[PDB]
Amino acid sequence: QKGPVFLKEPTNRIDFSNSTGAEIECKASGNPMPEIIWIRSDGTAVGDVPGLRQISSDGKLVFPPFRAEDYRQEVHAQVYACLARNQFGSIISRDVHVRAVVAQYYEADVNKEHVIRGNSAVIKCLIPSFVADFVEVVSWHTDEEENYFPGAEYDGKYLVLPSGELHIREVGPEDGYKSYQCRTKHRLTGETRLSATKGRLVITEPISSAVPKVVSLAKFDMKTYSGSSTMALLCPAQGYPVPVFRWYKFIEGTTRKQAVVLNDRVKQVSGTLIIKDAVVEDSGKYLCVVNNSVGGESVETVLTVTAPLSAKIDPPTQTVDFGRPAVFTCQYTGNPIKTVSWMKDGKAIGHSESVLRIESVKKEDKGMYQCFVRNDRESAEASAELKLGGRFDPPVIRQAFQEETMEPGPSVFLKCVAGGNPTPEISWELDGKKIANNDRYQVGQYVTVNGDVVSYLNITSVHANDGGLYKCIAKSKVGVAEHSAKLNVYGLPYIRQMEKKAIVAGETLIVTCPVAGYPIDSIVWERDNRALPINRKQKVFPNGTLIIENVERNSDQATYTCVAKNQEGYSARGSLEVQVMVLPRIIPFAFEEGPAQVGQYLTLHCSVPGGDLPLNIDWTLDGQAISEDLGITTSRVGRRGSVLTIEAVEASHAGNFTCHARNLAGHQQFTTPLNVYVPPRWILEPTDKAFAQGSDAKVECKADGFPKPQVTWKKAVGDTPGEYKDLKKSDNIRVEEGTLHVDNIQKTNEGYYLCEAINGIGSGLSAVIMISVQA
Amino acid sequence: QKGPVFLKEPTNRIDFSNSTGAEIECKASGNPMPEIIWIRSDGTAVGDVPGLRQISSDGKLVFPPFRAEDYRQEVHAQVYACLARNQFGSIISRDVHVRAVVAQYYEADVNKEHVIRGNSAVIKCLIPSFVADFVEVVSWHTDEEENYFPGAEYDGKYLVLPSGELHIREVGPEDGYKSYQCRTKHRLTGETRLSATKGRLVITEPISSAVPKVVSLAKFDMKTYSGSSTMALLCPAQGYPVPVFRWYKFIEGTTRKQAVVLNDRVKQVSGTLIIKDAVVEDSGKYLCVVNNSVGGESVETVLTVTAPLSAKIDPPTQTVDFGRPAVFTCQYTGNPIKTVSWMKDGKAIGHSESVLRIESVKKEDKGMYQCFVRNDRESAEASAELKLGGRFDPPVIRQAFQEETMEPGPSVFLKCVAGGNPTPEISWELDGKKIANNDRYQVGQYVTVNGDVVSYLNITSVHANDGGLYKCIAKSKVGVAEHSAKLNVYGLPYIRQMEKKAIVAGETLIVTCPVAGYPIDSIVWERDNRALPINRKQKVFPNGTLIIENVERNSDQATYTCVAKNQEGYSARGSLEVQVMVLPRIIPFAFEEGPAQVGQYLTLHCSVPGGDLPLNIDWTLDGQAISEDLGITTSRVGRRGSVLTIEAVEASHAGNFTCHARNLAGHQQFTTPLNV
């Protein structure tokens, strides 16, 4: 009554210890009640291993407890998958990574950390890389018996970073005394153990002015944090004098960078940036700059925040009639997505796009169609079913005429009684030609009381060469069904006329040499006297049918001939005119790579060589085709070329553009995207101002443009414009919402400040201003 | 007789210890014999500091020995530069980084290294980052008293990597016994000291099949190695079963990669790639892949091999005649080059391309032109001189009128007597406007027996607002020379007319608000009522001149105003119309990438937005422009676009094709090859 559907899959990750053991339950619903077979990475169904791996009832795959010696990679470190299936269809679950890890010994280390008196320290708890996955930092402990846990900052100095390190703010002599050591927990065994080696802070006292330096390799790193956690970006840099750390985030993909906005969610402890409550929007390339009076160094971080994968197919089940299209839409959530791929009753298909579209359904299309959305660490699945339409039964042929041979003279009566719902029309064909009430052929069709169509083909007096391949076609607007059969008439070989076969590039020409007369011996196809099959395109069969695979003009455009001859002498010739028209070849486009800014001049060029003479070239914007009122100038070029000109680009002109060009016996097109961005415009460019002594200076600079611009500021110090340099890093002077927020204005803060509005669409917007003091 | 030239510059880097001291000698040649003044980062000439820094004879800058307390950043951690100069001209040397470092204590550490029995180990000698620059690894020592130096591999197992690490190949139980410790040398103090902490190999039994793992951050790194050294690329990856390491080099810039070719010069020890005798060609993005039966991990390295910077200007000295062009070519070697920049007699110029080209030389162009080629760690300089040729003397102004003020009424007689060879023409200008025999201005010019031009400007009865900045221009076809001077007339403020100033993208607009009347107090420029300093590009001076640097249309195309007002009330307004003309931007082409076969249909499309209205678009084939007989159909597109159609392609149509399109106040073009 219903195909299978997963009610409960196993998780993506199952990690466990050899003393703990593990079980993974896979529950599937269906009708008939499906069996649950477990499968392996390659596709083979997984077997049993007494003691290590057992397949139990209710689709429960069990990995019982075991000893180190009993550990076996094949079983305890393997990619499993649950496959639920009934006689109606099959569905394989998402990937289940089984990782049994034998409870092995590990010891964490904490080594000496060297600091230049004044800089901030990061005491790292070194865990053996090979056990990292299962071991993490829990709490730090000092020899003075102080215990630093994760959470808020202790004494405004000591802070346990999310990533496990102990971050000592502003290291001074009073801290080279304490010996620090970490306490780790193994997330499978459940033991918390202290480090075997205690670290300490070697504090060295500054004499020479040391340029800020980073640990070479530590200059660049990529991190992948789990969703809605607390992320810890570090900027390892020592130096003297004590340097200052500034954080920036690059704008998606570009070389432009915005300064990081400090607040309640994102905070900066010394040089380390802490980001609370992570979201996917926080993903990107982060740059930390570290300056001091001597020099400046910089480090970067490629940060990627995750989001659980989850899939859903619309609709869950659908019933489609034969011949009609079936649509599956895969709806998915999660980040990042590396591979969206489709599947059918276990085995995969070629489709790797969200929407799977069957153009014309048939029997073999029945069953389950799965959609997979997977990445490096996760895999989400979604299921769906296709039922064969029905209670809407297609055309079938019951009492149908069968093969016959005869001598000319007698009346022949062929009958095709076809049934179906709705009641179909029955048309008659002879060797591909539709014959009607022509000559002495009479063709009839009535409907029986039961609702079946009885169609007769009466031939008054079958003639020498009426014989051939007759077929009736039971066609319904719900699908088609045909029945062919051979009628042989005594007589000399006689080949019918063949109207010119007009085929287009690359199509497969299938043609049958329509012979007549029954003692026919040999039907051979010839081109210019040579036997037809002489190249990779051409195939010919003794039944008298020719078939060319990939049609091409100067190759196979010609007048073919078929010769039919009986035993002892008599022969007949037929001449086919294979016309191979040249299908138009559209050459690709290129918009000016700006992209286009509002108020532009865009020129698009559609050029196409191909089928001479008729050339119908049109332009199409997603859904419709150019109403001139809109303001888009479509022109042609002499030899049926085309140029789409758009002066005065507007937002309305944004979207999917397509040159749709067709030519006698073909239709080809090409699509190009058109994005219409907008530059920065001011909505409040600043007002020349003089504040009172020590008043909080609130001067608002603000623009509007697409993409949203960033509002920089700068200052020129000595009462003169020209230096325009970055502001003076202090809580006194802040930038927020594009507003210059300079609290408690100092009498030295006279002079010109300059706000720039930029999104990178055109050159920048800029504004100069003088902020002064009064007392 | 000759401008200065550097015979001996100081090195880019001078590092030294407070007990050792250091001297940097800068020797320069010339005629007259040039003085050698030492300069500082900003451009100021460096002074003396008794005890710490002393400027001695022979251009020797001396940094004598000193005590820790005496160390001072300003002096002992500074960017110095030698400047040699004579009365003929000036030349400043390459940058000299002086880094005095007080002999301070350091202790190297060697910590526990954990390995999965079977994998290869890399025992690292941890040096304090802040002393790295002056401390490197010399040799390793084991508690069993074995000493591993750099060079070839010991016992086919132990190897000291170039970068100082101890690389233990295929670690087995028999090696968790030995305690390893490194011996470092300080390259300034000259002491070699052992590590304060001995490391060891914690060897662990493999039971669980562990996927190869790298140290997260250690997945990506950029290195910059010195030329012709031995480079050491590492691929830190443990795992079980014992994994296999494959190295690849990416093809310059692309996503395609080639497998690294092992031989005698480049060898692979376990997972670490060693490259001997480095060359710039070895620079690139290297990828190490590490696979095993369970999984696969990968690390990358951005490797950059250096090459000493060295510059040379062709020619070293040249003598050019007035009005004629002077060419300097900067020839340089070295890698990488970040900035090729030109300079003149100390102060820099705007040119940042190899070939410096003076289009028309004049007096002020005489002297030295330096070329700099610099990067992050190095800076190479090259010098050159320009002498003034002639025996063909340029225009000079002898008896010239000087500044004056007066009340209106009297007749004024300005005289510019200019000399030169040939005898120049003298034209008169007022505030940028050329005035002739207009109104009651009479302007004359005769030639004296001696061959000097005596040009007079007689104003019949100087009026209220004839006053302003008068200048005479002594122009010769061998060069030019001008003389300006101020004439003040007593009247109310009065600003002249200003014809629309038509400027093109990026040009520098310089404009002076032509006021008249002498008790004038305040000349201020305004845009739409705000005072005109209102965007980066804009500068304004109390003399009443405005100047915009980089002109751009919607930014600064507008009608500017200048207001001039005297003390107590009276004012006058002037309106300038600054127009930004736009130079045409031609969009590139694309022939069908076949290439074209004889008997073809080729369609080429020349599209250009820019200067509205006039648009002259032509097509050019190497040497000439389309004779229609040949069989090439040139068409236009509605809004002055262009389409070159060639049906029936022939051999004659092969060659260099170019769309040459010009627009009022500009000419732009683009070339495409046509290969049949």
Ligand SMILES: *[C@@H]1O[C@H](CO)[C@@H](O[C@@H]2O[C@H](CO)[C@@H](O[C@@H]3O[C@H](CO)[C@@H](O)[C@H](O)[C@H]3NC(C)=O)[C@H](O)[C@H]2NC(C)=O)[C@H](O)[C@H]1NC(C)=O
């Ligand atoms: C107001 O009026 C002048 C225009 O009428 C302004 O223009 C500036 O004049 C300066 C001369 O006083 C020039 O300065 C010189 O610039 C050259 C650059 O090539 C230097 O070598 C000189 O050493 C320098 N001399 C000094 C120290 O002044 C400016 O170049 C010029 N600006 C431009 C680009 O036109 C002046 O701002 C001002 N002067 C007066 C007379 O009041």
Ligand SMILES: *[C@H]1O[C@H](CO)[C@@H](O[C@@H]2O[C@H](CO)[C@@H](O[C@@H]3O[C@H](CO)[C@@H](O)[C@H](O)[C@H]3NC(C)=O)[C@H](O)[C@H]2NC(C)=O)[C@H](O)[C@H]1NC(C)=O
């Ligand atoms: C304004 O420009 C000039 C004064 O600013 C005047 O040019 C003057 O022409 C005079 C002709 O009358 C010359 O006077 C002659 O000087 C020579 C010197 O060697 C004597 O021999 C002549 O006797 C004498 N001419 C006579 C007989 O008067 C002057 O050379 C010359 N003035 C000066 C001092 O340079 C113009 O008069 C006047 N107008 C114009 C159109 O320029």
Ligand SMILES: *[C@@H]1O[C@H](CO)[C@@H](O[C@@H]2O[C@H](CO)[C@@H](O)[C@H](O)[C@H]2NC(C)=O)[C@H](O)[C@H]1NC(C)=O
């Ligand atoms: C799973 O493997 C571990 C390691 O072989 C076993 O745990 C050890 O058990 C022995 C014998 O009782 C103890 O001496 C060790 O101290 C244990 N190792 C640890 C964790 O320190 C464990 O017994 C195995 N599970 C079984 C036998 O099913």
Ligand SMILES: *[C@@H]1O[C@H](CO)[C@@H](O[C@@H]2O[C@H](CO)[C@@H](O)[C@H](O)[C@H]2NC(C)=O)[C@H](O)[C@H]1NC(C)=O
């Ligand atoms: C402070 O340090 C930063 C980073 O080193 C410097 O910023 C760079 O300056 C150069 C010019 O010298 C620019 O081309 C780079 O784009 C800047 N890096 C960035 C931010 O991407 C800055 O110049 C330093 N301050 C000093 C001493 O000038």
Ligand SMILES: *[C@@H]1O[C@H](CO)[C@@H](O[C@@H]2O[C@H](CO)[C@@H](O)[C@H](O)[C@H]2NC(C)=O)[C@H](O)[C@H]1NC(C)=O
């Ligand atoms: C440069 O300063 C250093 C640091 O003070 C001096 O080195 C001292 O040398 C004495 C005797 O040679 C030793 O006791 C110590 O190793 C150093 N003092 C300490 C503890 O810092 C050095 O003398 C100075 N250079 C000179 C000679 O002026």
Ligand SMILES: *[C@@H]1O[C@H](CO)[C@@H](O[C@@H]2O[C@H](CO)[C@@H](O)[C@H](O)[C@H]2NC(C)=O)[C@H](O)[C@H]1NC(C)=O
């Ligand atoms: C060894 O394993 C590595 C894993 O690092 C394989 O390389 C990846 O293969 C995936 C397969 O989908 C590719 O899409 C990635 O581009 C590869 N990642 C990188 C950059 O390493 C590799 O297939 C294995 N080696 C071979 C060639 O068999």
